[PDB]
A paper describes a structure:
The human P2 structure was refined at 0.72-Å resolution, using data collected from perdeuterated P2 (d-P2), and a number of intriguing details concerning protein structure were revealed. Based on CD spectra, the folding of the perdeuterated human P2 was practically identical to the hydrogenated protein. Upon crystallization experiments for neutron diffraction, large d-P2 crystals were also tested on synchrotron X-ray beamlines and observed to give sub-atomic resolution diffraction patterns. The overall structure was very similar to our earlier structure of the hydrogenated protein, but the space group was different. The packing in the new space group has, in fact, caused some disorder despite the high resolution of X-ray diffraction. In the ligand-binding cavity, the new crystal form had more disorder than observed in the previous 0.93 Å structure, and hence, less hydrogen atoms were observable, e.g., within the water-mediated hydrogen-bonding network. It is possible that deuteration weakens the interactions between the protein and the ligand/water molecules in the cavity, such that they become more dynamic. In the 0.72 Å d-P2 structure, the guanidinium group of Arg126 is a geometrical outlier, standing out at >8 σ deviation in the MolProbity analysis. Here, human P2 crystallized in deuterated form, in a D2O-based buffer, providing a new space group diffracting even better than the one optimized for h-P2.
Myelin protein 2 (P2) is a myelin-specific protein of the nervous system, which acts as a peripheral membrane protein within the myelin sheath. P2 belongs to the fatty acid binding protein (FABP) family, and it is likely to function in lipid transport during myelination. P2 has a role in maintaining lipid homeostasis in the developing nervous system. Mutations in the gene encoding P2 are linked to Charcot–Marie–Tooth disease.
Residue numbers in the entry: -1 to 131
Write the structure that this text describes.
């Protein structure tokens, strides 16, 4: 199952190419400016077979809960209404969002004690590094 080492509170410390990823998602400039500057936390918790991922910024939060393998509805931080699914593959949490005939992936893995999120939209890739608080 998901490693217990995912559980807890993670703080963003570095990011690369997030602006273009947000462009590719259709996010407008004003919102991209906040996404490029903010350093969110990501809180991962689990109760039974339900994993919860809560993202906190001072001006925008989000939260998803899911069971591995099972599709769920998600309203994203940029206000997309998606059908999403998270699977566990080779120790990574692999989240796919689908909306409007579009698709994006957000893979979260543990590497050297950090959480690495890799995001892909139509070949535009970004990486975000999180440390464990
Ligand atoms: C929720 C707190 C940050 C919100 C500020 C920016 C608003 C919208 C940008 C939309 C980006 C959607 C991707 C969010 C990041 C997914 C990968 C990650 O968790 O690091």
């Amino acid at each position: 199952g998901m490693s217990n080492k995912f559980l807890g509170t993670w703080k963003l410390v570095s990011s690369e190419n997030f602006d273009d990823y947000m462009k590719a998602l259709g996010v407008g400039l004003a919102t991209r400016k906040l996404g490029n500057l903010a350093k969110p936390t990501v809180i991962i918790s689990k109760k039974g077979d339900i994993i919860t991922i809560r993202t906190e910024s001072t001006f925008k939060n989000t939260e998803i809960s899911f069971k591995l393998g099972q599709e769920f509805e998600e309203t994203t931080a940029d206000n997309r209404k998606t059908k999403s699914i998270v699977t566990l593959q080779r120790g990574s949490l692999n989240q796919v969002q689908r909306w409007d005939g579009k698709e994006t992936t957000i893979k979260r893995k543990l590497v050297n004690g950090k959480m690495v999120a890799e995001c892909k939209m139509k070949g535009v890739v970004c990486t975000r590094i999180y440390e464990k608080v």
